[PDB]
Design a protein around this nucleic acid. Structure first.
Lengths: 185, 148, 127, 167
RNA sequence: AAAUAUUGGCGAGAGACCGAUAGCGAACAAGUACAGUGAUGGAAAGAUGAAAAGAACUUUGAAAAGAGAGUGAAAAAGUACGUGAAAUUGUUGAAAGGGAAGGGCAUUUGAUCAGACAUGGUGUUUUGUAUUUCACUGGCCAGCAUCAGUUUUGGUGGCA
RNA sequence: GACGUAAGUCAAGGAUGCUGGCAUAAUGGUUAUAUGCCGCCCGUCUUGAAACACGGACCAAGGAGUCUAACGUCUAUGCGAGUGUUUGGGUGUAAAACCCAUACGCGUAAUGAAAGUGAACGUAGGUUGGGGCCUCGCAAGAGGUGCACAAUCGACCGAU
RNA sequence: ACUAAUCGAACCAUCUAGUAGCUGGUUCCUGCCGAAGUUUCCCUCAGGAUAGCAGAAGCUCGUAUCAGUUUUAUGAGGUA
RNA sequence: AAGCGUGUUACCUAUACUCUACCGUCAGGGUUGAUAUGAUGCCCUGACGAGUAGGCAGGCGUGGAGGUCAGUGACGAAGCCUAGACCGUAAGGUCGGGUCGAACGGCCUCUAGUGCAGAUCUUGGUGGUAGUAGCAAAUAUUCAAAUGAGAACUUUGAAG
């Protein structure tokens, strides 16, 4: 009989293993679990806890964003690591030569990168070429950009997007949204 | 499937996950959008503001054909050219030989100006265009012509 | 025989019976949780039947073990039995109930040859 | 297959025991046990028989010989806990007891082949009782009434209390 | 005209369907028996056995029927028939019993039940060389000595 | 870690050594009963049920959060600025499987009631914090780069 | 009153499985966490929505921008 | 005083506290250059474990589907009974015996008309009540013979 300041048997709340069934995506976790444990490099710990993220938490990273990462001084020769997919981009027309390690590359991204003189690899080549994250650089896709997030935290006077199928006149543009009729939000 | 439904986990629990005192009934709050103004007013003015009332004029016999105006920003303008011939036009910027990008036949009505096209000549065929969309085309040396 | 093992402590040998199982014939003996809002059993009143809990969970090193110290294996034929050839120490054979008599004499002879212990050798004999 | 298979077969090898840090130190005895004292047997064939403690064997038992011609107890070993040590003693520096030890009282070598399903004293066990008793009977006569006391058994009378009774 | 609809009719083919309280109300002489003045309402009821081979014949009884015999692989398949559960009932047996009984902890008493190790076993002369003709240990239960952890009860010594 | 010049030994990261009996109903299990103590009849409504609250004579079977249209969050998978074959067509071993075009749906641009307009001054901006990486640093630590993100000030687009 | 044992609106079938903020019931086990009966609005008081309390999914980081706490200092109160 | 007021100690016992073992959950960790059945596994350390409504996770079970065990079975499948045994904390699983007669399992998945003690639940059946209440209005039967196995009730006669 003790007082319990906090909630007991509280699960840590973080994903410990990818609850995807994918065997290959568990082989990568098996490799990086060994690297994260058997090395002191914080980079392996980071990538290990990025392999578990869900699909919404592993947003696509555009090759345009890869280029923007290489625009930083001191990062011209650094390898880029994207724990997730890497989709291409029509926005950029010049791509610097570099090496990218990502879980999945779209066929458009491979064509754009390899033709640009770069090279595409996966996390296991990355482990081979750089165990402890030498001269590496981790990129994360934008997370609040999801369309499901425009409606998150909806309330009065919040500037959020109401949940609605059809958007246009006669749909949430009357009393309660405009000051002429009823009130404003 | 049915075997993963919490109902199978609710067998034996008398209330079937609905509460002893709540006594899950058929329609305790109404049917559909009932009480949108009386007893669900707080919901309908918090989560769905602007549901009730007029706004705007009434368009009689609306046709979405008239308002078909898909927008093509200038960043995507180079996706119209097939990827095989994009490079031969990206390199060798030629004033007297500029690719004729026809946006209409690919299903684009208006050219907008989200911008940053490479400074090479380009030919744009669109029904409409925005003011800044032109200037970026002209600043790249291209021209815009009117088709319909 | 089997490997040396910790002493088999069952820690609750009494079978858990459902509340009022004897009182009503319709109440099956099988244990179902008494989820009543007033039942003295669910509130763990004194002098009442004990509810299954983890605490009655047996020791891992002596779980699934027979009093002879062997984890029983349900064998159906000779081919199934041959899997336990080197595993005679832990696993003891057990002929399935539906194996025919002429199919038991072959297994018992084969099992006795390999020295694997069978916990139903007195099953379905002919004299 | 009636029951398919358990993959994780246990460790079929047997693990050796850990090095146990327990020696076998010599037994220490309660102060009431002095060679030549008189004990009272508590459990066994000769319960309540007075006896004389002779030597402490390395098998943590007591080699006692209540003179066989007195109380009928042979030169036999008993357990230290199952005897009550009485204050009285008999001097025993005139008896040779060295030849009696653990291997002497060895019963016999018995296996399952020699199973007495249905159901003789060595001459040495008799002569050695004599020679040992010779010293006892010679040096027990000098004190009066001890031979009578040693012959008689012992039992708790009614109205007495073993805790406040000093032995 | 066609592409379209078709829980009616006829024919046909299928089913991750139901399986005799299910599936049509209706697997069976079912819109039948039956109820209602009438409109209408409307059930229950499938399975011996491969084959009736459906128990000839003897005896008791008035007869049903019983006992036999017999057919049958089986009558623990006899048409009141595949298997035949429980409530409920009888017989026998076991137990208990001063206004309930029943249940839990613990154990007695009685009844009843799995098991070792009784192992090629640290080997020993085979009757024209694979029987070791005495074995190593654990199976149960304890006792003692030395220890370790927790604790309890004391006897004392020194010191402030 | 101790004791030992040391070798070693030990009460030092958890029990050993010896001995005896029995080897089976002996220990134990199940069950019945007895004895000590305890235990109110369950489900539900309820602040409160053993209730002088209601349902429940007993037994067997049947019996109650299912399916679908459209969605929300979450998650998995495929592809990914695209995605969706299966309205249809070709094919087939024939309700399967395989292949296929254009459209169309959602997304890529928002805003306005509408006419309409429509998103880079800047390295896609600045500031602060920011995992990680990099330079030095034995190491802390100091710097540089700092994606995601959080706040804010901006900048551009629509409307007034 | 009576109108086929039916009458302050017969009986039969269908729409119909009418409606229910109301009553009763809601079937296996174990494990972990674990409340509320309060705010506000409602022809609202046997009910809902909304906030609160709870679970789960987690996400960003790694000892802090913390705390049903005290001290110090400085305010405020109008109860005993 | 076994009352009152007070004090001294001794003592009794909670599922409380301490320690130990075991179980589960949580957290923090360890575990791959011929080392382990090759990683949701194994192992170490520590702290916790009440609970309705309710949430979530892991499992047991039933009807059927795809696959596999070249699975089981007329020398006996399923079913059923079993104060017989074992396993699992439990849902349940497995075995032994008897009846039994023809199909049915284990595992990986898939699916659903998937688990009953209740609903004055439905249908069917059977109880205690219980050999009980009752078979008492209509004045009323009796004798003998006959038939018949059997006569208060049938005849026929005689009476009333």
């Amino acid at each position: 009989g003790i007082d319990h300041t906090s909630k007991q048997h509280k699960r840590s709340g973080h994903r410990t293993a990818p609850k995807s069934d994918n065997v290959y995506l568990k082989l990568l976790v098996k490799l990086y679990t060994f690297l994260a444990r058997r090395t002191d490099a914080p980079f392996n710990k980071v990538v290990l806890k990025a392999l578990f993220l869900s699909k919404i938490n592993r947003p696509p990273v555009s090759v345009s964003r890869i280029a923007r990462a290489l625009k930083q001084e001191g990062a011209a020769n650094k390898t880029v690591v994207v724990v997730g997919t890497v989709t291409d981009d029509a926005r950029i027309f010049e791509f610097p030569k570099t090496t990218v390690a990502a879980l999945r590359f779209t066929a458009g991204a491979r064509a754009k990168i390899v033709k640009a003189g770069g090279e595409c690899i996966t996390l296991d080549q990355l482990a081979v070429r750089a165990p402890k994250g030498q001269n590496t650089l981790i990129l994360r896709g934008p997370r609040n950009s999801r369309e499901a997030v425009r409606h998150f935290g909806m309330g009065p006077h919040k500037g959020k997007a109401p949940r609605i199928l059809s958007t246009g006149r006669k749909f949430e543009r009357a009393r309660g949204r405009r000051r002429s009729k009823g009130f404003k939000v | 499937p049915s075997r993963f439904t919490k109902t199978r986990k609710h067998r034996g629990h008398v209330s079937a996950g609905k509460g002893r005192i709540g006594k899950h009934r058929k329609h305790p709050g109404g049917r559909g959008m009932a009480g949108g103004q009386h007893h669900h007013r707080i919901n309908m003015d918090k989560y769905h503001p602007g549901y009730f009332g007029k706004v705007g004029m009434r368009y009689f016999h609306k046709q979405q054909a008239h308002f078909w105006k898909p927008v093509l920003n200038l960043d995507k303008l180079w996706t119209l050219i097939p990827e095989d011939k994009r490079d031969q036009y990206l390199k060798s910027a030629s004033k007297e030989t500029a690719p004729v990008i026809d946006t209409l036949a690919a299903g684009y009505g208006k050219i907008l100006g989200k911008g940053r096209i490479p400074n090479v000549p380009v030919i744009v065929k669109a029904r409409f265009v925005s003011k800044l969309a032109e200037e970026k085309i002209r600043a790249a040396g291209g021209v815009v012509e009117l088709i319909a | 025989a089997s490997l040396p093992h910790p002493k088999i402590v069952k820690k609750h040998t009494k079978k858990f019976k459902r509340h009022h199982s004897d009182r009503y014939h319709r109440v099956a003996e099988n244990w179902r949780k008494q989820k009543g809002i007033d039942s003295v059993v669910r509130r763990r009143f004194r002098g009442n039947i004990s509810q299954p809990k983890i605490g009655y969970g047996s020791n891992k090193k002596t779980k699934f073990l027979s009093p002879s110290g062997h984890k029983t294996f349900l064998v159906a034929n000779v081919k199934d039995l041959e899997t336990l050839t080197m595993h005679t120490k832990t696993y003891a054979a057990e002929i399935a109930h539906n194996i025919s008599a002429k199919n038991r004499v072959v297994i018992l002879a084969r099992a006795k040859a390999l020295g694997i212990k069978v916990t139903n050798p007195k099953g379905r004999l002919a004299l | 297959s009636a029951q398919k298979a358990p993959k994780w077969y246990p460790s079929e090898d047997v693990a050796a025991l850990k090095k146990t840090r327990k020696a076998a130190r010599p037994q220490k005895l309660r102060a009431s046990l002095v060679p030549g004292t008189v004990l009272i047997l508590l459990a066994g064939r000769f319960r309540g028989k007075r006896v004389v403690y002779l030597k402490h064997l390395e098998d943590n038992t007591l080699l006692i010989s209540g003179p066989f011609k007195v109380n009928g107890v042979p030169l036999r070993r008993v357990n230290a806990r199952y005897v009550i040590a009485t204050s009285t003693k008999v001097s025993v520096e005139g008896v040779n007891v060295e030849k009696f030890n653990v291997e002497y009282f060895a019963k016999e070598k018995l296996t399952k082949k020699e199973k007495k399903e249905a159901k003789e004293i060595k001459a040495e066990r008799v002569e050695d009782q004599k020679v040992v008793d010779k010293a006892l009977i010679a040096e027990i006569k000098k004190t009066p009434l001890l031979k009578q006391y040693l012959s008689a058994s012992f039992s708790l009378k009614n109205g007495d209390k073993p805790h406040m009774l000093k032995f």
